[PDB]
Design a protein around this ligand. Structure first.
Ligand SMILES: NC(=O)C1=CN([C@@H]2O[C@H](COP(=O)(O)OP(=O)(O)OC[C@H]3O[C@@H](n4cnc5c(N)ncnc54)[C@H](O)[C@@H]3O)[C@@H](O)[C@H]2O)C=CC1
Ligand SMILES: NC(=O)C1=CN([C@@H]2O[C@H](COP(=O)(O)OP(=O)(O)OC[C@H]3O[C@@H](n4cnc5c(N)ncnc54)[C@H](O)[C@@H]3O)[C@@H](O)[C@H]2O)C=CC1
Ligand SMILES: NC(=O)c1ccc[n+]([C@@H]2O[C@H](COP(=O)([O-])OP(=O)(O)OC[C@H]3O[C@@H](n4cnc5c(N)ncnc54)[C@H](O)[C@@H]3O)[C@@H](O)[C@H]2O)c1
Ligand SMILES: NC(=O)c1ccc[n+]([C@@H]2O[C@H](COP(=O)([O-])OP(=O)(O)OC[C@H]3O[C@@H](n4cnc5c(N)ncnc54)[C@H](O)[C@@H]3O)[C@@H](O)[C@H]2O)c1
Lengths: 324, 324, 324, 324
């Protein structure tokens, strides 16, 4: 009587397929790979189905161009949209140039979620992340706690990796957060970086790392997306983005109460409301179950507010289109 | 001081990166992504490094364009090559058309394995699989038991998947083997298909599956690679090929004594010698530890011989190109 | 909101605690450890809770002496009862001697399952297995397909282990089944043993194993439980029994459609009905979804019938106790 | 040529067996279960071998009464000892009471490690922990960095569990350390407790947890071992101790560079030397690679010094017994 969890991946591109692969490997549930491109998602679904046999896991992987197949989905993860705006080089790529392109897609997707799986937990990945999640939320009519954006987990995992590498410790034992908008005004929280709860400052004071190296890592974290785009030559990152979204999905599916930075609907926290922005949150069976309001210093609070200001800017541009 | 296992991936494209992802997820050991394309492997290595942080695993992922970095690898997995021959068409995709382009790449890679990592266990993926592994082996100087080709695990995973699908059981509990050349004359062994050891014939007698349905599944298995190419539009399968090769690498790294079908150097088994072709084998810490010689019926033996003949015919082309 | 799966373990002894540990490690769901012994399950639940933190899993483990706490359990696994009959030596240890003691306990548990979690999938472990599961089913009023006994997965795992050990191959690649009653008259199906679908017979001919060795392995499988008892000195096996029951529980919870040998309610299969006996079955979200009827030879069929008669002998003793 | 890792467990009791189970589930390497009791480890090894087949893992489990079988071990984990001093009661259970019984055992074990596997990484569990590891180290001749005691990971996991429970978040996201002696004077470092790097102090201010609740948890953490002893009625904890020890073993075997609190040989850190005591350490392929010196406050430093003093006093008892 109790069926497997159902996870619909709206967008079967690099990140879409990669998330499906994680689902197959982890046996998270049945997977629906949706895309507007004909044949391709069916192709990937076949490949993934074969991969599940190798993994000795029990997972149906379905490729589709029909929104009807997302019916009854427990989780929906959205990557539909463009990665690199047309006519832009590698060394000038920006998430903000995509807004006119991707906003209309979020409406169509939101509308379809509304009628096929209105009780799904929905994770948005499409850029510009923080406004795309807002557009999705509006047109889907979903509860504020059942929709969020993936960015913070990815930005934070990068911050963690860079710190872990410099200190030569397991990234499991580094805690680091990046809050705010997903972009150049993201706010890596150096003051909150710990090694198993030990303040990063203790490693400074002990000369395991210098403040200047920390400053460089902060900058590298902010630019990490572009760094990868430049090195690859084609497209952008997808391994860590896929893993990031699936960590959020697992938190929901198994009611884990993970503390993860996600793009969450604010209802007054940090003195802001009516937008999604990167904040630490408790993720569980009820979606975004809690937004944690950090005791930011005035300096930190100003960086966050400037970050939120960027989102506000894009939001008007969205308003000057016609997507409620 | 016992270091982590070191796995070098020669070729950092679709399958290479995907394999590196599994290594990160599974914490198999440190990964070197080698490619001739500048910067791209470094870019992917960054993305994969970030994903390892998310996975809470402890894995070093290095992107490189220098064969020196493969020194002392425990396992080397080779994907270097073209996926589709230049100037060809989708429905006309053939593994054989890659022979003249990929043959010389196998010579180059072999020469470099010879000098930098002669003690590695080497898994070849590059198509056309069975002759590519021969070129690699010949030019690398490695022992016969330390080189093999990934094909049988993938072909068998497909055969298993389709059987499991039709019978509606877990693929874990379906045993199916495909032997011979990795191409149109591969031999799906219907007589050897079992469900937890229960012969497929019992399911036929009990009317759970028909001979006609089995026949369709046999042909579908043969055409699976091309089916995916036609659907994907760009490139060929990579999720299952990646998983297959890593299953083989795991068998070596942890001396598992897995029974896997791989392209192995024959020394009289099945009445054939001095070529690589798909056969059931025991894989462990000594590489291809044992080729299993199945009690084939005359009909099966003839199918196998015709399969081997295709490898011999491809070999004539290798010889005529002057690639040994 | 969707809650985590809930698994109630009725009996918190060795097997009970061990299953709880697997649950914590695998994050299968929240665990309730029930026992009539005061304080002990609370103590184990604390210990296990700490182990879940170490494992980075998200699992509540609750020890209890009250049946109310099994409310809403998705799976119930029952180990309540004695392991050894009082006034019996190890060399005379017999599962049959546990009957009058454990029969009455199965009645109580079934009554409590009826009122507290009538929709659970129930796995009985308590000996004498095949008749204990019938008692439990009778007094629980549960559907025939939602109750079964763990025995065949354990007996088969032993058969597999001993075969794999002799052939020196991965137990993953050995398929072996033991059907019939869980006792001296269990039936290890030598004819159905395969190595990745390859009949064991081929390895006899190829000289990797002899019929004499196989015969001795059959005997060792039958005696495996008593062999461990004699070696241990106190109680009986628990690591493999726990793992066997959890494998069954996982098949249900994730609707895997695994082919596992379990003690299942027969309704005409093999020419028998209205008793539980070990047979191959497909386990999924609807419990015992299908009982597979093997094409046993007359000789095999006679061994199985003899096995079934042993269950009937025990059953008649149950009738004596005046418990319907 | 490259063999599986080899892990020897000196002591095949509750914790020994449980650790072997984890090795089997995780496929960490082959396992030797050593004990002075005849037949018992052989019995457990069989049970565990069967469970490996169920897990589809590839692990040899060997029971023995001969030290010769621990030769070539990569890791050795020692649980040889009594759990409760004879003549004593549960409520008055004290690890210190075990000293005169287990000290001579550590000498015996140490002597045998000296001659059979001097190159192993050795983890001691036997109580009283901090002085038992010292006796073992003294009589084994091993390097200072290749020997340590399991305590801090367990104490910390308990601290973590209790904090995570109260705040209703995943224990993955709670960082908490307990340093010092493994006993009543252990030091749960409240100041260093974080939720993904967020200081616990913020949660106090935001009214998510009270100082009173924290004080209770600190006491509960100190008393946790005795709490379980009282509840179980027999023996002491084993699920979490086994897991803690395996976490340490994994960190070594795969060179993970984990930050874990372990009883480590001090050489001037914190102002102390030549004793083992619980401190944060980096564990990797070189064993105890680094002892981290925390910037303790003067109050915290006093607690730690008082904790170290307890070890010194236990050490006085060792010398008085005639065990150096
Ligand atoms: N069953 C099987 O055996 C399968 C085989 N394949 C084969 O695997 C190969 C790779 O497939 P994908 O990873 O999808 O292709 P891909 O095109 O994504 O990656 C191939 C990579 O090899 C690199 N390369 C080219 N020359 C090289 C050299 N001399 N040394 C090192 N690297 C070099 C390229 O720069 C490219 O990044 C193809 O030959 C394909 O036919 C693919 C799927 C299944
Ligand atoms: N946090 C910690 O450090 C913890 C420490 N412990 C300690 O771990 C030790 C073992 O606990 P359990 O496994 O539960 O006890 P157990 O009584 O179940 O097993 C102890 C085993 O050691 C064996 N043994 C005795 N003398 C020996 C010798 N000379 N050589 C080899 N083996 C010998 C016994 O035969 C017995 O099987 C105890 O000393 C206990 O106090 C237990 C829990 C947590
Ligand atoms: N931190 C982050 O949030 C993060 C990280 C990486 C990428 N991204 C973003 O995620 C998105 C996906 O990236 P990718 O690498 O998978 O790109 P991709 O080009 O590989 O995938 C996009 C897919 O969406 C499909 N698509 C386009 N319009 C659609 C519609 N109306 N309905 C359904 N599908 C449609 C395309 O056919 C394509 O397959 C991009 O917008 C990218 O900017 C975000
Ligand atoms: N193949 C198999 O099916 C298989 C394998 C191993 C053991 N077993 C059987 O499984 C059972 C459990 O074995 P074990 O090693 O866990 O024994 P154990 O003695 O360690 O555990 C039995 C537990 O059941 C409890 N109990 C007794 N009456 C109860 C009641 N009315 N309600 C709740 N709990 C009650 C006891 O207090 C004890 O904690 C035994 O009957 C044994 O014969 C079966």
């Amino acid at each position: 009587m109790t069926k497997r969890k159902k996870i619909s991946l709206i967008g079967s591109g690099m990140i879409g397929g990669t998330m499906a692969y994680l689902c197959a490997q982890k046996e998270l549930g049945d997977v629906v790979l949706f895309d507007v491109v004909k044949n391709m998602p069916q192709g990937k679904a076949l490949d993934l189905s074969h991969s599940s046999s190798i993994a000795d896991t029990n997972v149906k992987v379905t490729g589709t161009n029909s929104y009807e197949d997302i019916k009854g989905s427990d989780v929906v993860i959205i990557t539909a949209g463009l990665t690199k705006a047309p006519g832009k080089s590698d060394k000038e790529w920006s998430r903000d140039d995509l807004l006119p392109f991707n906003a209309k897609i979020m409406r169509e997707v939101g509308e379809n979620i509304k009628k096929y799986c209105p009780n799904a937990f929905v994770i948005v990945i499409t850029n510009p992340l923080d406004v795309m999640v807002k557009v999705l939320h509006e047109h889907s009519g979903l509860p504020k706690n059942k929709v969020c954006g993936m960015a913070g987990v990815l930005d934070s995992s990068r911050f963690r990796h860079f710190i872990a590498e410099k200190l030569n410790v397991s990234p499991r034992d580094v805690q680091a957060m990046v809050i705010g908008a997903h972009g150049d005004k993201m706010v890596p929280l150096t003051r909150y970086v710990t090694v198993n709860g030990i303040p990063l400052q203790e490693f400074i004071k002990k000369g395991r790392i210098t403040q200047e190296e920390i400053d460089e890592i902060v900058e590298r974290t902010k630019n990490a997306g572009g760094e990868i785009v430049n090195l690859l030559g084609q497209g952008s990152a997808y391994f860590a983005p896929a893993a990031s979204a699936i960590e959020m999905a697992e938190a929901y599916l198994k009611d884990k109460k993970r503390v993860l930075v996600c793009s969450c609907y604010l209802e007054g926290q940090y003195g802001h409301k009516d937008m999604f922005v990167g904040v630490p949150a408790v993720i569980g069976g009820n979606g975004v179950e809690k937004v944690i309001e950090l005791e930011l210093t005035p300096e930190e609070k100003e960086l966050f507010d400037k970050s939120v200001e960027e989102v506000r800017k894009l939001q008007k541009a969205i308003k000057a289109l016609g997507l409620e």
